[PDB]
Design a protein around this nucleic acid. Structure first.
Ligand SMILES: [Mg+2]
Ligand SMILES: [Mg+2]
Ligand SMILES: [Mg+2]
Ligand SMILES: [Mg+2]
Ligand SMILES: [Mg+2]
Ligand SMILES: [Mg+2]
Ligand SMILES: [Mg+2]
Ligand SMILES: [Mg+2]
Ligand SMILES: [Mg+2]
Ligand SMILES: [Mg+2]
Ligand SMILES: [Mg+2]
Ligand SMILES: [Mg+2]
Ligand SMILES: [Mg+2]
Ligand SMILES: [Mg+2]
Ligand SMILES: [Mg+2]
Ligand SMILES: [Mg+2]
Ligand SMILES: [Mg+2]
Ligand SMILES: [Mg+2]
Ligand SMILES: [Mg+2]
Ligand SMILES: [Mg+2]
Ligand SMILES: [Mg+2]
Ligand SMILES: [Mg+2]
Ligand SMILES: [Mg+2]
Ligand SMILES: [Mg+2]
Ligand SMILES: [Mg+2]
Ligand SMILES: [Mg+2]
Ligand SMILES: [Mg+2]
Ligand SMILES: [Mg+2]
Ligand SMILES: [Mg+2]
Ligand SMILES: [Mg+2]
Ligand SMILES: [Mg+2]
Ligand SMILES: [Mg+2]
Ligand SMILES: [Mg+2]
Ligand SMILES: [Mg+2]
Ligand SMILES: [Mg+2]
Ligand SMILES: [Mg+2]
Ligand SMILES: [Mg+2]
Ligand SMILES: [Mg+2]
Ligand SMILES: [Mg+2]
Ligand SMILES: [Mg+2]
Ligand SMILES: [Mg+2]
Ligand SMILES: [Mg+2]
Ligand SMILES: [Mg+2]
Ligand SMILES: [Mg+2]
Ligand SMILES: [Mg+2]
Ligand SMILES: [Mg+2]
Ligand SMILES: [Mg+2]
Ligand SMILES: [Mg+2]
Ligand SMILES: [Mg+2]
Ligand SMILES: [Mg+2]
Ligand SMILES: [Mg+2]
Ligand SMILES: [Mg+2]
Ligand SMILES: [Mg+2]
Ligand SMILES: [Mg+2]
Ligand SMILES: [Mg+2]
Ligand SMILES: [Mg+2]
Ligand SMILES: [Mg+2]
Ligand SMILES: [Mg+2]
Ligand SMILES: [Mg+2]
Ligand SMILES: [Mg+2]
Ligand SMILES: [Mg+2]
Ligand SMILES: [Mg+2]
Ligand SMILES: [Mg+2]
Ligand SMILES: [Mg+2]
Ligand SMILES: [Mg+2]
Ligand SMILES: [Mg+2]
Ligand SMILES: [Mg+2]
Ligand SMILES: [Mg+2]
Ligand SMILES: [Mg+2]
Ligand SMILES: [Mg+2]
Ligand SMILES: [Mg+2]
Ligand SMILES: [Mg+2]
Ligand SMILES: [Mg+2]
Ligand SMILES: [Mg+2]
Ligand SMILES: [Mg+2]
Ligand SMILES: [Mg+2]
Ligand SMILES: [Mg+2]
Ligand SMILES: [Mg+2]
Ligand SMILES: [Mg+2]
Ligand SMILES: [Mg+2]
Ligand SMILES: [Mg+2]
Ligand SMILES: [Mg+2]
Ligand SMILES: [Mg+2]
Ligand SMILES: [Mg+2]
Ligand SMILES: [Mg+2]
Ligand SMILES: [Mg+2]
Ligand SMILES: [Mg+2]
Ligand SMILES: [Mg+2]
Ligand SMILES: [Mg+2]
Ligand SMILES: [Mg+2]
Ligand SMILES: [Mg+2]
Ligand SMILES: [Mg+2]
Ligand SMILES: [Mg+2]
Ligand SMILES: [Mg+2]
Ligand SMILES: [Mg+2]
Ligand SMILES: [Mg+2]
Ligand SMILES: [Mg+2]
Ligand SMILES: [Mg+2]
Ligand SMILES: [Mg+2]
Ligand SMILES: [Mg+2]
Ligand SMILES: [Mg+2]
Ligand SMILES: [Mg+2]
Ligand SMILES: [Mg+2]
Ligand SMILES: [Mg+2]
Ligand SMILES: [Mg+2]
Ligand SMILES: [Mg+2]
Ligand SMILES: [Mg+2]
Ligand SMILES: [Mg+2]
Ligand SMILES: [Mg+2]
Ligand SMILES: [Mg+2]
Ligand SMILES: [Mg+2]
Ligand SMILES: [Mg+2]
Ligand SMILES: [Mg+2]
Ligand SMILES: [Mg+2]
Ligand SMILES: [Mg+2]
Ligand SMILES: [Mg+2]
Ligand SMILES: [Mg+2]
Ligand SMILES: [Mg+2]
Ligand SMILES: [Mg+2]
Ligand SMILES: [Mg+2]
Ligand SMILES: [Mg+2]
Ligand SMILES: [Mg+2]
Ligand SMILES: [Mg+2]
Ligand SMILES: [Mg+2]
Ligand SMILES: [Mg+2]
Ligand SMILES: [Mg+2]
Ligand SMILES: [Mg+2]
Ligand SMILES: [Mg+2]
Ligand SMILES: [Mg+2]
Ligand SMILES: [Mg+2]
Ligand SMILES: [Mg+2]
Ligand SMILES: [Mg+2]
Ligand SMILES: [Mg+2]
Ligand SMILES: [Mg+2]
Ligand SMILES: [Mg+2]
Ligand SMILES: [Mg+2]
Ligand SMILES: [Mg+2]
Ligand SMILES: [Mg+2]
Ligand SMILES: [Mg+2]
Ligand SMILES: [Mg+2]
Ligand SMILES: [Mg+2]
Ligand SMILES: [Mg+2]
Ligand SMILES: [Mg+2]
Ligand SMILES: [Mg+2]
Ligand SMILES: [Mg+2]
Ligand SMILES: [Mg+2]
Ligand SMILES: [Mg+2]
Ligand SMILES: [Mg+2]
Ligand SMILES: [Mg+2]
Ligand SMILES: [Mg+2]
Ligand SMILES: [Mg+2]
Ligand SMILES: [Mg+2]
Ligand SMILES: [Mg+2]
Ligand SMILES: [Mg+2]
Ligand SMILES: [Mg+2]
Ligand SMILES: [Mg+2]
Ligand SMILES: [Mg+2]
Ligand SMILES: [Mg+2]
Ligand SMILES: [Mg+2]
Ligand SMILES: [Mg+2]
Ligand SMILES: [Mg+2]
Ligand SMILES: [Mg+2]
Ligand SMILES: [Mg+2]
Ligand SMILES: [Mg+2]
Ligand SMILES: [Mg+2]
Ligand SMILES: [Mg+2]
Ligand SMILES: [Mg+2]
Ligand SMILES: [Mg+2]
Ligand SMILES: [Mg+2]
Ligand SMILES: [Mg+2]
Ligand SMILES: [Mg+2]
Ligand SMILES: [Mg+2]
Ligand SMILES: [Mg+2]
Ligand SMILES: [Mg+2]
Ligand SMILES: [Mg+2]
Ligand SMILES: [Mg+2]
Ligand SMILES: [Mg+2]
Ligand SMILES: [Mg+2]
Ligand SMILES: [Mg+2]
Ligand SMILES: [Mg+2]
Ligand SMILES: [Mg+2]
Ligand SMILES: [Mg+2]
Ligand SMILES: [Mg+2]
Ligand SMILES: [Mg+2]
Ligand SMILES: [Mg+2]
Ligand SMILES: [Mg+2]
Ligand SMILES: [Mg+2]
Ligand SMILES: [Mg+2]
Ligand SMILES: [Mg+2]
Ligand SMILES: [Mg+2]
Ligand SMILES: [Mg+2]
Ligand SMILES: [Mg+2]
Ligand SMILES: [Mg+2]
Ligand SMILES: [Mg+2]
Ligand SMILES: [Mg+2]
Ligand SMILES: [Mg+2]
Ligand SMILES: [Mg+2]
Ligand SMILES: [Mg+2]
Ligand SMILES: [Mg+2]
Ligand SMILES: [Mg+2]
Lengths: 122, 117, 52, 137, 204
RNA sequence: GGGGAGGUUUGGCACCUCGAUGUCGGCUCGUCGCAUCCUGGGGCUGAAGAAGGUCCCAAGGGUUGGGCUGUUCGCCCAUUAAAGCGGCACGCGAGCUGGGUUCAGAACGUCGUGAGACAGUUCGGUCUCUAUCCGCCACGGGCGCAGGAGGCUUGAGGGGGGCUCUUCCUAGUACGAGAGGACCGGAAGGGACGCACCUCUGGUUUCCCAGCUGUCCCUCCAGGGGCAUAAGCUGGGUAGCCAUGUGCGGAAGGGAUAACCGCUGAAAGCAUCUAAGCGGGAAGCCCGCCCCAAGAUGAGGCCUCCCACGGCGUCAAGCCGGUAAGGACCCGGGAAGACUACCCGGUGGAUGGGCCGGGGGUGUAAGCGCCGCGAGGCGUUGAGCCGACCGGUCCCAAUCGUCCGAGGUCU
RNA sequence: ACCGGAGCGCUGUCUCGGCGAGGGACCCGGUGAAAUUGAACUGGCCGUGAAGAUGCGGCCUACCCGUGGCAGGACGAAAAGA
RNA sequence: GUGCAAGAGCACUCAGGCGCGCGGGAGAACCCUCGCCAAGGAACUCUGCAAGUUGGCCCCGUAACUUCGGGAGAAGGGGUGC
RNA sequence: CAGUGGAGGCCCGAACCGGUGGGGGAUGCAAACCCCUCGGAUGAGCUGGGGCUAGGAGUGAAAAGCUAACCGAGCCCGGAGA
RNA sequence: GGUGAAAAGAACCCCGGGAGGGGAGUGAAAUAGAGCCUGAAACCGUGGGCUUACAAGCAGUCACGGCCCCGCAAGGGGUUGU
């Protein structure tokens, strides 16, 4: 479950390394954001002269979580860290090649751009 | 509320535990022990396990009962006289009887734990 | 002595009233097989003994 | 009415026996009936079993594996209709029931911490190839 | 207006076609009609359904005559079902086809004298900076000289749960007539053993 | 330039209170007003559409998280359908806090010869276990209910709930130069909230299992106990209770209305929604759903069971005892519970305890054999131990027994 | 152990509470206080009155008596207002 | 007395002494004291108040600044049993 | 420079002295206490016993602090029925 | 501060561990029996009469009625339903 102060790992090559969440984008008052949810977030650290710098407020989409996601088929799935990818207002990834696994949930959300670039769509 | 669970007990743990042990010791030393109704009902089930266990024989079962009762001689007596007497009597190796007396001073209801015979 | 304090002396009437359900209730006893003596149900008894 | 158990168990005809034994601390890959865009496929999942959560029916179990630098864990209902074929791959010394401690030290130390249960290994390969020859003739 | 008594037997999940489904299992044994009340004899329409078998000795009551008045094995319990005059002499799980949605009444679990936080999911107080006296308290409860009293129905701590609770629109899943079983969409009031009634919902 | 409403601001007056009516903020808990921030309805538009403007109707519900400050307020970040304004002693300190201010300490600026002083500033600085009454939440005992008793009920009356968005289909159609982009009707997903539940996910699980240190002891070795908390520490855990987990709810629908739209239609040959009359029309009103509920003393209904008088008061109202149906005590006990109440059982019995089996947890007891100098390893072994769950079995325990309870007024 | 600003670590401070242990609370037996106290047979609303009424007016509601619990009122107690 | 780098520290324990002059149950809310917690990790709040983190020894290693003594246990890291 | 040496209102830490912060306690165990935490810990150190200084007076690393549980002038009689 | 004129201060029996009672006995008197003359009031209690579980109150007053009580009646006492 991601929330306001939560730090996320960056799954893509956008140049950012870690972004703290800023606001979970959803209802007028959504408490948490899980896989496939888009969030506003400040960049808290980034590679030198990347595409996006520190302090840049950006939109991003959760791809991995530490809290396990329940599947309709009774199955479940859990990662080692909370990660996310930076996106456009067009809702498309600012970066290219996005490394590290992702949840199948991203598919039913319209993020096939990501699942395509993603190596392990688990 | 959460009494959806097995039995009840006073004191803390190490205390109440040593309590069950200490009653059992006496109870296997005298066969007939008078005590408060509650203490009795709980002690009832505790001893029955010790008997049915002594009903076995292997030194494992012996050493097992050695954890609660500490006197080697008392447990010796258990595996010799006590257990056989209760041969073939699966379960209910002990009895509890409500006494009509009430301890003066605290007004506690008394009862009796008898090794059945 | 502190915060909560009785605002008025409770009248003797209102006092006694509260002690309405205060009254005791007699013990329950039954004749035994042994003596004609009265034992409380589900019990042994001195000067009477028992069986089994 | 004195059947509260059997009754719940009656509903349990959804059971399955095709599935092999497997105790925590030994890698295992399951083929899972995953649905793609709209079609169906069988995604494989190779990894160590960390937890088996017995509870009669609906007894689940979980599997953890490294996947491109990231650790992943999947929980599977044992009698899940979606589990195509669960294939063992290697068995090892448990010495413990639930073993998450592997989350803290995923490395070559995990290997030297989870030996190889030669006991079950022998019984496996033996009863496998030996029972083959008996079914043949 | 279908209806039928039963007991919550337990709950586990089954697999629909290819997705898992948490379902509760109710047991609505054969319920013998004991008295049909018409607008003539009473003032409404309804049926008295009996339930579990009974030791004829325990029912020495005048109930024996009520049972005889309809000639039925002494049941243990019996409740009415409004606006519902069936057929035959007994209702069964046969009344419910899988897919039909039902309302299940039941008696919630007994929590006794429960705190306000427990009961009304209040907020209580701060665990740190404040006084270690109001950690789980309701805090304020009114105003000043006006109204100078406390609103009837103010949420406060007290006996809670263990009451008539009806959950609704639960879809009936596979129903086994072979054993008088009845599966539902899981959440249903009461403990595993409580008498529950199962009616027809209101979707329209 | 003129008339007024409100009683949230600043203030005037000095009326209760100085043998005390605790002050600002915050928290907790709210509730009410409507002059409506959002959602619903509607008129006009300099309303093409979408978006918006102003005015009318309407509280049902809703009305986010954070940075700065003691702040209220305000500014700002990110979002929203919207982030409404007031009252309730600027609601709430016998509910909490005590950051602000109004005790003593100390300091800066400033004023005073001075001691000191300053709605100027700065650091520090005791917020009082026990509720008698009203009120309130819960739970009982009494009596009543025109005969007594068991079960099942009606529902006057009251309470709960009442929110909302996004995408898609209609259709890229109407409208439009283009960009944009609908009414109406239909589908799917979601936020917060509420009720219930433990399958699942995830907690706890105080002794269920295992490992480990120090030490003291049983019995020298092995094995085991005590203590290191009120578990010594550690790894792990059923049932129960739970949310982070699952289900389901807000309706639909009927009826009457608000603003407003309209039919027929005079008064007043025309004209008018009105004066007689009628139709349409809200997230709102009534009902419908869900909960309580006959102390509804206006004590309701149904079904069934028991039913004369045995002795005093001359009509009349009553009193004493044995009883009936039936009830209570007493006991074993419960996802019932502070107590009491409630429900099940009490030998014609499985209610509890034990025991057996199953589920579950732990994860290969001990002893012996074997390999190694040794610490240890391997085998017998998924062994041993094993709460609470699902059942079974009279081994123990619910023995025996007692008390109460009508005899039914009159027209 | 002075007063301010920041960051890393770690956290039930918080989102947001949950379960558990023990000592009280609660029931039974023994002992048994206190401040306070005009007398009380001490309900709601809207008026009203020395201007914030259980006690006046009008209306509404309400069988008698307890136990556990909450603090809104009794301008609650306390101290002849600093 | 044993153990832990040392010790009058800590844990257990001799000799010696004691279980604190009301008990018996039950296993509500609430209070105290204490244990644990998914995800998040100061969002709490006047303030990280409180709590948690870290902790002993041995080795490696250590900055600005300095009044050359300090800053230093800086910091960061490795080892620890049989 | 190495060795020896063992300085210090030096460091860490019990006893002992003290009272940072928090919680509890508030008709208390207690007219200042308890728990956790925290300062000093060879010194301007702590402490036993014997002595001296007092009411406009004494003491005071200075708070108008202390001078027998309330000190901007102790307590007890007395002027005094101010 | 106070038995009584005098101690004549209650032998003996009964219940009880005792305390205290019950008879007996002294005395004019023993509710003059020993911290004992008289023995008021608040306050606690037992028995009897009237009364009370649809009711709203500074507790009274005025009226009528009912029940009990002194008198033959007329009258008066007590209680309280409206
Ligand atoms: Mg990090
Ligand atoms: Mg943005
Ligand atoms: Mg920067
Ligand atoms: Mg910026
Ligand atoms: Mg993390
Ligand atoms: Mg790919
Ligand atoms: Mg590839
Ligand atoms: Mg894939
Ligand atoms: Mg249970
Ligand atoms: Mg012990
Ligand atoms: Mg212990
Ligand atoms: Mg057992
Ligand atoms: Mg054992
Ligand atoms: Mg009286
Ligand atoms: Mg009395
Ligand atoms: Mg008996
Ligand atoms: Mg005999
Ligand atoms: Mg069952
Ligand atoms: Mg099969
Ligand atoms: Mg295919
Ligand atoms: Mg019945
Ligand atoms: Mg009904
Ligand atoms: Mg809280
Ligand atoms: Mg405080
Ligand atoms: Mg306090
Ligand atoms: Mg009022
Ligand atoms: Mg169950
Ligand atoms: Mg004007
Ligand atoms: Mg005003
Ligand atoms: Mg006002
Ligand atoms: Mg004014
Ligand atoms: Mg004047
Ligand atoms: Mg004043
Ligand atoms: Mg006063
Ligand atoms: Mg006051
Ligand atoms: Mg003030
Ligand atoms: Mg603020
Ligand atoms: Mg309006
Ligand atoms: Mg306006
Ligand atoms: Mg809408
Ligand atoms: Mg128009
Ligand atoms: Mg408009
Ligand atoms: Mg328009
Ligand atoms: Mg428009
Ligand atoms: Mg509002
Ligand atoms: Mg409402
Ligand atoms: Mg805001
Ligand atoms: Mg702030
Ligand atoms: Mg601030
Ligand atoms: Mg300002
Ligand atoms: Mg600014
Ligand atoms: Mg700003
Ligand atoms: Mg702005
Ligand atoms: Mg925005
Ligand atoms: Mg605002
Ligand atoms: Mg306004
Ligand atoms: Mg308000
Ligand atoms: Mg005002
Ligand atoms: Mg003002
Ligand atoms: Mg108040
Ligand atoms: Mg306060
Ligand atoms: Mg305040
Ligand atoms: Mg202050
Ligand atoms: Mg303070
Ligand atoms: Mg001034
Ligand atoms: Mg000025
Ligand atoms: Mg100023
Ligand atoms: Mg300032
Ligand atoms: Mg300040
Ligand atoms: Mg200040
Ligand atoms: Mg303070
Ligand atoms: Mg206290
Ligand atoms: Mg209390
Ligand atoms: Mg009072
Ligand atoms: Mg009052
Ligand atoms: Mg009351
Ligand atoms: Mg009642
Ligand atoms: Mg009706
Ligand atoms: Mg009513
Ligand atoms: Mg109604
Ligand atoms: Mg809506
Ligand atoms: Mg177009
Ligand atoms: Mg055109
Ligand atoms: Mg766990
Ligand atoms: Mg569990
Ligand atoms: Mg144990
Ligand atoms: Mg064990
Ligand atoms: Mg040994
Ligand atoms: Mg040991
Ligand atoms: Mg010991
Ligand atoms: Mg010992
Ligand atoms: Mg101890
Ligand atoms: Mg510790
Ligand atoms: Mg655990
Ligand atoms: Mg929830
Ligand atoms: Mg209109
Ligand atoms: Mg129009
Ligand atoms: Mg005309
Ligand atoms: Mg017209
Ligand atoms: Mg008309
Ligand atoms: Mg008109
Ligand atoms: Mg109409
Ligand atoms: Mg209409
Ligand atoms: Mg409408
Ligand atoms: Mg309505
Ligand atoms: Mg009813
Ligand atoms: Mg009735
Ligand atoms: Mg009736
Ligand atoms: Mg008969
Ligand atoms: Mg007869
Ligand atoms: Mg006859
Ligand atoms: Mg006759
Ligand atoms: Mg009878
Ligand atoms: Mg059992
Ligand atoms: Mg082995
Ligand atoms: Mg072995
Ligand atoms: Mg061994
Ligand atoms: Mg041998
Ligand atoms: Mg050999
Ligand atoms: Mg070797
Ligand atoms: Mg060996
Ligand atoms: Mg096993
Ligand atoms: Mg055990
Ligand atoms: Mg067992
Ligand atoms: Mg059962
Ligand atoms: Mg008889
Ligand atoms: Mg009788
Ligand atoms: Mg009669
Ligand atoms: Mg007539
Ligand atoms: Mg400041
Ligand atoms: Mg009590
Ligand atoms: Mg006083
Ligand atoms: Mg009034
Ligand atoms: Mg008047
Ligand atoms: Mg009362
Ligand atoms: Mg009450
Ligand atoms: Mg009581
Ligand atoms: Mg209180
Ligand atoms: Mg004065
Ligand atoms: Mg004065
Ligand atoms: Mg020593
Ligand atoms: Mg060692
Ligand atoms: Mg110690
Ligand atoms: Mg711990
Ligand atoms: Mg842990
Ligand atoms: Mg946590
Ligand atoms: Mg952090
Ligand atoms: Mg931060
Ligand atoms: Mg700070
Ligand atoms: Mg701290
Ligand atoms: Mg270390
Ligand atoms: Mg540590
Ligand atoms: Mg530096
Ligand atoms: Mg060091
Ligand atoms: Mg050091
Ligand atoms: Mg280290
Ligand atoms: Mg190590
Ligand atoms: Mg030198
Ligand atoms: Mg030195
Ligand atoms: Mg020197
Ligand atoms: Mg120092
Ligand atoms: Mg050291
Ligand atoms: Mg000393
Ligand atoms: Mg000192
Ligand atoms: Mg302190
Ligand atoms: Mg302080
Ligand atoms: Mg303090
Ligand atoms: Mg304090
Ligand atoms: Mg010296
Ligand atoms: Mg020196
Ligand atoms: Mg000195
Ligand atoms: Mg000296
Ligand atoms: Mg001294
Ligand atoms: Mg001295
Ligand atoms: Mg001296
Ligand atoms: Mg003088
Ligand atoms: Mg002087
Ligand atoms: Mg001087
Ligand atoms: Mg003195
Ligand atoms: Mg003094
Ligand atoms: Mg003077
Ligand atoms: Mg004096
Ligand atoms: Mg003079
Ligand atoms: Mg005389
Ligand atoms: Mg004399
Ligand atoms: Mg004399
Ligand atoms: Mg005497
Ligand atoms: Mg006599
Ligand atoms: Mg006489
Ligand atoms: Mg006499
Ligand atoms: Mg007299
Ligand atoms: Mg006399
Ligand atoms: Mg006498
Ligand atoms: Mg005497
Ligand atoms: Mg005389
Ligand atoms: Mg008295
Ligand atoms: Mg008295
Ligand atoms: Mg009255
Ligand atoms: Mg005469
Ligand atoms: Mg006369």
């Amino acid at each position: 479950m991601i929330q306001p102060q939560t730090y996320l790992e960056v799954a893509d090559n956008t140049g950012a390394r870690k972004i703290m969440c800023i606001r979970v984008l959803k209802g007028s008052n959504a408490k948490y954001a899980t896989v496939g949810d888009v969030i506003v977030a400040s960049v808290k650290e980034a590679i030198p002269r990347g595409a996006v710098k520190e302090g840049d407020v950006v939109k991003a989409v959760v791809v991995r979580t530490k809290k396990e996601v329940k599947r309709p088929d009774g199955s479940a799935i859990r990662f080692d860290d909370n990660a996310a990818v930076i996106i456009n207002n067009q809702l498309e990834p600012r970066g290219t090649r996005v490394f590290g696994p992702v949840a199948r949930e991203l598919r039913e959300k319209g993020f096939m751009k990501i699942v395509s670039l993603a190596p392990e769509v688990l | 509320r959460h009494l959806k669970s097995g039995r009840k007990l006073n004191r803390h743990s190490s205390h109440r535990l040593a309590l069950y042990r200490n009653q059992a010791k006496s109870l296997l030393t005298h066969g007939r022990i008078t005590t408060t109704v509650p203490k009795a009902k709980e002690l009832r089930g505790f001893v029955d396990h010790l008997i049915h266990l002594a009903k076995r024989g292997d030194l494992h079962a012996r050493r097992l009962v050695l954890r609660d009762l500490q006197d080697v001689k008392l447990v010796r007596k258990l595996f010799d006289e006590i257990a056989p007497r209760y041969r073939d009597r699966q379960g209910g190796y002990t009895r509890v009887l409500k006494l009509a007396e009430r301890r003066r001073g605290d007004g506690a209801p008394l009862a009796l734990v008898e090794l059945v015979e | 002595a502190k915060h909560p304090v009785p605002k008025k002396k409770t009248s003797k009437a209102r006092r006694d009233a509260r002690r309405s359900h205060h009254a005791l209730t007699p013990p329950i006893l039954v004749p035994c097989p042994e003596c004609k003596a009265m034992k409380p149900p589900h019990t042994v008894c001195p000067e009477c003994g028992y069986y089994a | 009415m004195n059947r509260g158990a059997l009754i719940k168990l009656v509903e349990s005809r959804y059971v399955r026996t095709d599935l092999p034994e497997f105790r925590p601390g030994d890698t295992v890959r399951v083929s899972y009936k995953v649905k793609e865009g709209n079609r169906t496929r069988i995604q494989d999942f190779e990894g160590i079993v960390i937890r088996i959560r017995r509870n009669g029916f609906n007894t689940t179990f979980t599997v953890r594996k490294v996947s491109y630098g990231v650790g992943v864990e999947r929980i599977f209902p044992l009698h899940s209709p979606l589990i195509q074929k669960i294939d063992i791959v290697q068995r090892g010394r448990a010495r413990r029931a639930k073993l998450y401690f592997i989350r803290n030290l995923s490395d070559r130390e995990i290997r030297r911490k989870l030996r190889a249960d030669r006991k079950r290994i022998d019984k496996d390969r033996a009863a496998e190839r030996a029972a083959k020859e008996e079914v043949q003739k | 207006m279908k209806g039928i008594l039963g007991v919550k037997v337990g709950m586990t999940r089954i697999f629909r076609d290819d997705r898992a489904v948490p379902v509760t299992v109710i047991l609505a044994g054969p319920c013998p009609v004991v008295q049909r009340r018409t607008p003539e004899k009473d003032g409404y329409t309804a049926v008295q359904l009996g339930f579990l078998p009974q030791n004829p000795k325990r029912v020495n009551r005048p109930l024996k005559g009520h049972f005889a008045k309809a000639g039925v094995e002494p049941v243990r319990i019996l409740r009415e079902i409004r606006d519902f005059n069936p057929e035959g002499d007994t209702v069964t799980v046969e009344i419910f086809k899988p897919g039909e949605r039902v309302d299940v009444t039941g008696t919630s679990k007994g929590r006794g004298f429960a705190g306000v936080m427990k009961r009304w999911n209040f907020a209580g107080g701060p665990d740190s900076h404040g006084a270690h006296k109001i950690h789980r308290h309701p805090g304020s409860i009114g105003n000043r000289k006006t109204p100078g009293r406390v609103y009837k129905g103010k949420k406060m701590a007290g006996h809670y749960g263990a009451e008539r609770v009806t959950v609704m629109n639960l879809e009936v899943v596979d129903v086994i007539p072979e054993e008088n079983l009845l599966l539902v969409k899981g959440a249903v009031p009461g403990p595993n053993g409580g008498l529950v009634i199962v009616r027809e919902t209101k979707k329209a």
